[PDB]
Amino acid sequence: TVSEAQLARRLTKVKNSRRMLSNKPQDFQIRVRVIEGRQLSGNNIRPVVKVHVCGQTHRTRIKRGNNPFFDELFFYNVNMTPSELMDEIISIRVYNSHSLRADCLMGEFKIDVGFVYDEPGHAVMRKWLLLNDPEDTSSGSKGYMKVSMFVLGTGDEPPPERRDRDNDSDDVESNLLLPAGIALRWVTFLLKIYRAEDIPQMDDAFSQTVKEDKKNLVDPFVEVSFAGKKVCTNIIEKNANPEWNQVVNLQIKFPSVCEKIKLTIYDWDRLTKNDVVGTTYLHLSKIAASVGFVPTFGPCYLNLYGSPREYTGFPDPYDELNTGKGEGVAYRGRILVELATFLEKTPPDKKLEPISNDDLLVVEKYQRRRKYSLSAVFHSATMLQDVGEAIQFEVSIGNYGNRFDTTCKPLASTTQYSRAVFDGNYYYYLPWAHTKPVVTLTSYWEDISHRLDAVNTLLAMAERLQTNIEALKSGIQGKIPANQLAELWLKLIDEVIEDTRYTLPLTEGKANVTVLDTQIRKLRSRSLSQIHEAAVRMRSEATDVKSTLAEIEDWLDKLMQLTEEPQNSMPDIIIWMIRGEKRLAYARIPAHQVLYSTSGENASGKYCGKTQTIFLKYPQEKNNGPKVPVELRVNIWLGLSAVEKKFNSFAEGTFTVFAEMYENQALMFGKWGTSGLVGRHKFSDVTGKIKLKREFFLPPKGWEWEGEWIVDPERSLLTEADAGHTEFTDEVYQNESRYPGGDWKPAEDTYTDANGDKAASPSELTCPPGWEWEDDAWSYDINRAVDEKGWEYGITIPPDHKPKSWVAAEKMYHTHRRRRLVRKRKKDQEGWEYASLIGWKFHWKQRSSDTFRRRRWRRKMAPSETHGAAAIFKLETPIVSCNFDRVYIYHLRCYVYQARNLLALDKDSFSDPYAHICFLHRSKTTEIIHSTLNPTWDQTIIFDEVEIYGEPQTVLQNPPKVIMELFDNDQVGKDEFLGRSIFSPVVKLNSEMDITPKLLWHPVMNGDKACGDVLVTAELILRGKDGSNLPILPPQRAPNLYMVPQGIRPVVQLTAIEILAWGLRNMKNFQMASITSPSLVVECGGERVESVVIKNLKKTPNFPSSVLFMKVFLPKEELYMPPLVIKVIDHRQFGRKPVVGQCTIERLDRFRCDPYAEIVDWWSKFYASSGEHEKCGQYIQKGYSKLKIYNCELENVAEFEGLTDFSDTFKLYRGKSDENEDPSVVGEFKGSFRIYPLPDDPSVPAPPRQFRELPDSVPQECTVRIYIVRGLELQPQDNNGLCDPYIKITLGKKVIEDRDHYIPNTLNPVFGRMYELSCYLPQEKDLKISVYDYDTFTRDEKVGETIIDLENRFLSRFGSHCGIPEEYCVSGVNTWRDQLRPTQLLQNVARFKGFPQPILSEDGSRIRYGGRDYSLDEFEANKILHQHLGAPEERLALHILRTQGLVPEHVETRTLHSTFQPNISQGKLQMWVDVFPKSLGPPGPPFNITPRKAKKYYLRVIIWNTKDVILDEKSITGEEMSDIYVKGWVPGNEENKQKTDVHYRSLDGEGNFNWRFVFPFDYLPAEQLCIVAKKEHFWSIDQTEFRIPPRLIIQIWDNDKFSLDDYLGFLELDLRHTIIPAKSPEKCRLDMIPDLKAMNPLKAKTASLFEQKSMKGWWPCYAEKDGARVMAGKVEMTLEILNEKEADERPAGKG
Ligand SMILES: CCCCCC(=O)OC[C@H](COP(=O)(O)OC[C@H](N)C(=O)O)OC(=O)CCCCC
Ligand SMILES: CCCCCC(=O)OC[C@H](COP(=O)(O)OC[C@H](N)C(=O)O)OC(=O)CCCCC
Ligand SMILES: [Ca+2]
Ligand SMILES: [Ca+2]
Ligand SMILES: [Ca+2]
Ligand SMILES: [Ca+2]
Ligand SMILES: [Ca+2]
Ligand SMILES: [Ca+2]
Ligand SMILES: [Ca+2]
Ligand SMILES: [Ca+2]
Ligand SMILES: [Ca+2]
Ligand SMILES: [Ca+2]
């Protein structure tokens, strides 16, 4: 249907804006202005409009008449998610008010905020609404509502108007918000709920143990939120697998749509609050496209994610994850839903229905389970932070694989407990080595492989395309020549051509195919055909690749939106690290990324059978913070169990399972024997409580025995033998214990190690052979979470014996203390383990007190040849571990060159950064660069002999991440976190790939924002038999300290940096003293230049010498350019020179340069330039000129470069920046830089200096004239929605406020006032202009604030100190206000631009300028030289000055910023500032911008006769006596209602009055509307000026001298669009007045009463009933209007 395609078009227009990044807090402001009502229903109504936006309802005050006018603007300040605001509704609803009764409903229109947010201009511009009654929508429209609604986000601005009458304010059929093609039909989404499964326990579970099934302790129901309405299903009592089967009939109207269906399962509770199970969403644009199709979805499961499944009686701290906020860390069950979009049948009361039985029969084919086998090979778990407890890894997909719900059979889906060992430098790692732990588990999910094959293939397409675009971007960035770019682009387009002929998998023959599957396959086929055809067109058409790069970037995002799959029913694989018995960290791998497909490798996942690197996160961290818990590399292979034999091609190594059998003995009389075993069996298990036998273990199907039963005492020796490192810092801990409140003493375990038990003293430590000590003494560590003495404290509570956590402070309840000691380094076995007690912890050697022993009696099982490595899935405790038969030796070199924009984490505004370079089980620390935020380490970090297991091609495909953690070194305390950069090294395996690695700026991520960048690269060379294939060692500037080699280091060249040290502004006090003697230091590339010291900053705010010069070596590449460092030093007594300010400038590309390169006043001028005033009282025809209205700031006009062309803006900072934001702005340095290369030898002369034409740096007194014109759409600061604004201007030490001349009760104030001050630039450059709300009995509110750099106005080359007008006048209201004549300004710009001095001709009609010649006739054409013009030479010299790109005479619209919403408009201030420095003379006469007074007007009407008025029903006399009397008034002046005398003996509508009405009113002919001033009520503080259009509403009325007043009709005349009357009453008939809703609208003949002053004719009055208009009669008028003097010329009576 036609409604289907336009709904799909609306949903795709929704789709192309649902891609902005959703900040969870975001301030928003919505301006809803109502303007004018038209054709409102009813008779003699009193219309009112109530607008409800986001729960806040505003209210315009009462008007009367069926065509009202309000012109009141409403503000809505909300704070919510930006995606949530586009689903909220704006409900503007019209009532008919009454004096003594409640308001009755008269109309309604609901439009969502989304439509006014995708609308161009970020808003809608005065569109008309189709008001309809919500319960009476079948009877047609009830009126029209001209509204203009706005959306202002953070950083957004509103657009200006454009002339407001040419296609606006009339013939409203061309100005609908929704045209006639958009129906008002309902859209009904049949959002069906079928069932749910695996819902976690949310009940107390103690009442069920009384009964003498425990997983079913939840009472779920579905709550669905959609456009604010909430529908809840029935409650299923005590069932974790509920069977709701209920349709939910969501309903919206076509004007107001909602995108985000929110499904939230809640656990119903009888007493307490309803718990949250999980929250998943439907996005309607993701399930729709535009040929196109409606939203369709399901039947498919949606997985819920949230809090961990462990039930606690206490409130779970991760319950915020259950509401959909955050990503969610654990599987919360899943719900089977369906969606269908219908457009008819609008079900009013059956919101909840049962599912029909045929739909239950259909849904069974989407519920079929398939067996899935998942394996995970844990390769390396490094970057650990503690050693206190053993670490386990659990793999679970869905509810399958949870190791805590022990009510069912455990699936053996977790590793065993591995205790980390120190890597020698900073971190820890689990010592897996050649024995990787393998986790195998079996789940059951629906076979939805027809979706995930397509998802994986299009994702592989997008990844190949992204790799080729990264190669092409490196090609264009590196200036690689054109033939290589042509070859790479041809390879790229060949990749696109070869890829996009891929056919999507067929939906035929598969039970799980939905309607959305067919529509998605059709859309994907159409998109792939379009991409393939456009690629085969462009491969033969296009030649330039930079033009096609933009289309290719669109193709990449098109491929990204093609991989979106809302029907991904496979839950994510969640890997949990369990330290002890507690959940610690999580990672969610999507199941499609590891799912195996038989359709090919592209249809399989990206990391299917490959060792991916994942960083775990803490359960409520949005990003990685100071501590990453563990970096985990794991080879995850998920697949169907029917094709699990294909796992053999992905498996590496040999999988190995061990049977274990334990025999115990004891010692008496010097001989070991079987006596004395009490409580533990002779043959038993690992715990000794369960008796086992050697014959109890037999291999299952697919396994076989390898070897014989052997003793295994070699577990102690084979734990890597500490041979993986050459430099190692050993660590020995010390432990003490005490009573609570007692004295400290050493414990029985006085010294511990990484084994978690007792060890030898530090004096007894000896090096192994091949090792030696670096230092002969130990030392304690301060760089941890400890106090100044290196001690941390813990508390023990029984029955626990040892602490589980430590803190840095000592309390009276702490019973343990621990200290870490470090020392650096360079370069029996009878088959039994012995312990002191039976069933105790056995040790590798017999101690003095050991009297019991045991041994391990184990046999190896190998997989058979008939099964391969797939036998690990057929075991279903067994332990499966993959053993690698060989090791590969690598060699990693990290070239850490420099860093930029690091955080200031010291009190002296800098840091001491160093880098922990970590790569698997190896780590090394770079040196510390002191007192900088932009270090240059210039260092190479070499990890010789790194053992990485697996084939070298798997390390080529998925290299391990090199993770660098930057830290601010502190001499005391703990070193603070700067950030973390994660990047991959380039991999080399032989000599044919020996290209030089390229340094790249990788981000230093702290929190969720990039706190700087680091220039670093790495390479990982595969070592052969020895180090011969490795490259040579880099040169050393220090022992064991390698320099970055010549190939990797950027090539430096000699280049000059010129610094314009102009001056310092707003220097705040440092150490409670003013900055009296500052200086500037500019450092770049290790070489600094220092300016002269200012003797007094208050007396002279500018440096005496403004030019600085330094020769530095900087890289030739613009990417490799180091940051520019500015430090402001303060010179104080006793030689003290602290740093009081610092800024980092990294965007140095803007600094590179080629060194060899009827009455007329000002409001007539203002209204003519706006364009809304024209062709009505215009003054352009007299030959005058206009001005340039800027819709933004003058510093936001791109023609003037932000007015920083002389010297830019750099804020200075100081001190530690908490919560990784920018530090406090304690000053400002003003200056600019010019960087240009230099010759290497002095034989070539130096390039010329770039700063030669500097102005004088002394302070100058300036006369600042601030002309403030008007304010536009200010934020209301009163309870009535209005404001009483005035102007408060602060300028240095002079503050001028105008509270005595405030403008009462306006949101659009006409200020029109001058505020002249004298300020000394640049000490008082901070011109702050603020608007303030007057309040009589309470505090004032700040409407807005803006800052103008007056020194930018003074010192710019664009002449922004005074805007040049288009004409040079010497009289009138357009008199030249600048101090300097246009000849002098032309001379100034000529000597500024390097042009020679301009020459006046012998007659003044030519001036030579800038190598060209100018004539008077070139600019004076098509203009009238009236009497106010000045000299012709100054005229043409001003005419030259307009073509120079200077600032014209302007009224800039400055944004009013406030702290209430920081980067959002709180109003606007049309104004301008002229700066007049006193050095070049006094300025001219100022402009008079005083607002013009409204001239008096007298409207006179005369009512001659009436005809065919509706007769009365029954009077006192008992006839058809309609006592006709005619009353009429100008609206706005309802207190001046005038009525005629009562006519009598009327039985046919005939009346005779000859009674005259007079209404005076104040009018502006320019703005074409009038003002009436009256108070709001008797207790209002001041009068309000109402700006309404001129019109005249006159109603026929039945007198009823002895009865009640009865209405007859009404008639309206807009005085600018007065309809042409008929010359005779019989020619007057119905519907020459405009009709808008009853029949197909036609424009009426109109003429202005102001232009055509008087005419006589007949006008029809009408009344409306039953939705139709009837003729209520005719009235004879002579409508005349006069001004004041014409009214005084001829007085009139009877009024
Ligand atoms: C022995 C248990 C007696 C339990 C007796 C009892 O009446 O418990 C009711 C509640 C738990 O019930 P909820 O449905 O709120 O749990 C839902 C859960 N809060 C959630 O957010 O998931 O317990 C407490 O408030 C305090 C329990 C303190 C238990 C020490
Ligand atoms: C609708 C009328 C209700 C009845 C009157 C009523 O409650 O008025 C409230 C206002 C609040 O003052 P503002 O108008 O500045 O509101 C400021 C604004 N809220 C803001 O955003 O800051 O006036 C007083 O309190 C004056 C008390 C004088 C006592 C002598
Ligand atoms: Ca509960
Ligand atoms: Ca419950
Ligand atoms: Ca509860
Ligand atoms: Ca610090
Ligand atoms: Ca420090
Ligand atoms: Ca106020
Ligand atoms: Ca006020
Ligand atoms: Ca107030
Ligand atoms: Ca009557
Ligand atoms: Ca009557």
Side-chain angles (χ1 to χ4, degrees), residues 1276-1279 1282-1284 1333-1336 1338-1341:
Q1277 321 283 178
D1278 289 324
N1279 275 77
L1282 257 287
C1283 189
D1284 311 308
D1333 174 35
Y1334 177 121
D1335 287 316
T1336 313
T1338 197
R1339 26 147 185 71
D1340 284 14
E1341 281 87 51

Side-chain angles (χ1 to χ4, degrees), residues 550-776:
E551 183 167 23
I552 266 46
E553 280 182 314
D554 156 79
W555 281 10
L556 192 274
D557 217 18
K558 156 166 211 212
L559 272 175
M560 295 324 300
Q561 44 150 59
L562 285 190
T563 65
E564 286 274 11
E565 187 71 66
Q567 296 184 118
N568 193 11
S569 71
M570 305 275 335
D572 287 2
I573 294 149
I574 305 123
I575 300 186
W576 274 101
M577 174 189 16
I578 301 170
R579 183 158 58 81
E581 303 296 327
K582 212 166 314 321
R583 290 197 188 281
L584 185 54
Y586 81 110
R588 277 179 45 183
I589 308 107
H592 69 91
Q593 283 189 355
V594 298
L595 185 59
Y596 169 70
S597 177
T598 54
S599 304
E601 307 91 58
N602 293 284
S604 301
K606 182 179 177 181
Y607 305 115
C608 172
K610 292 176 175 65
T611 311
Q612 62 185 289
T613 308
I614 44 189
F615 292 83
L616 310 207
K617 300 197 294 284
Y618 284 106
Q620 222 164 345
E621 287 298 320
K622 69 303 187 183
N623 287 93
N624 294 309
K627 265 81 173 293
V628 154
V630 70
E631 179 249 26
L632 187 64
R633 283 176 64 245
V634 58
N635 193 291
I636 298 176
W637 188 92
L638 173 67
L640 286 162
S641 180
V643 292
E644 78 199 350
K645 189 155 275 190
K646 307 293 181 183
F647 178 61
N648 295 354
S649 68
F650 294 91
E652 43 188 11
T654 296
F655 289 86
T656 300
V657 64
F658 289 106
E660 57 195 317
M661 194 31 233
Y662 281 76
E663 175 177 359
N664 306 280
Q665 278 196 344
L667 173 64
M668 319 80 191
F669 313 107
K671 295 185 179 181
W672 293 97
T674 63
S675 303
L677 300 180
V678 179
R680 300 295 187 273
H681 308 291
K682 171 184 174 178
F683 294 117
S684 70
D685 73 304
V686 293
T687 72
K689 302 177 182 179
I690 300 172
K691 188 179 177 181
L692 294 176
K693 297 189 191 183
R694 292 175 163 111
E695 67 180 10
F696 277 177
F697 299 95
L698 284 177
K701 197 168 185 175
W703 290 95
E704 66 186 48
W705 292 123
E706 175 170 300
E708 210 46 84
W709 291 93
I710 56 167
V711 201
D712 202 2
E714 313 286 338
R715 299 301 106 218
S716 176
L717 184 62
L718 290 176
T719 320
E720 212 169 58
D722 210 23
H725 309 84
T726 48
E727 292 87 60
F728 202 97
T729 300
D730 227 319
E731 43 163 12
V732 169
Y733 291 85
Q734 185 169 324
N735 296 74
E736 307 194 352
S737 307
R738 74 158 185 191
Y739 288 106
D743 295 337
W744 292 101
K745 71 171 189 288
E748 65 256 41
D749 296 338
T750 171
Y751 288 109
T752 56
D753 52 14
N755 289 276
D757 50 20
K758 75 111 171 184
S761 62
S763 52
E764 290 171 319
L765 258 302
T766 46
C767 278
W771 289 79
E772 65 269 342
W773 293 102
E774 173 65 37
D775 296 316
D776 295 338

Side-chain angles (χ1 to χ4, degrees), residues 529-548:
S529 181
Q530 281 176 353
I531 291 177
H532 188 275
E533 286 311 289
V536 87
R537 213 273 319 283
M538 158 215 283
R539 206 191 74 168
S540 297
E541 174 197 47
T543 49
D544 200 20
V545 312
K546 306 92 163 172
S547 61
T548 67

Side-chain angles (χ1 to χ4, degrees), residues 190 666 1023 1123 1158 1473 1569 1610 1613:
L190 262 63
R1023 280 183 53 115
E1158 199 267 328
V1473 173
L1569 77 150
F1610 93 87
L1613 295 303

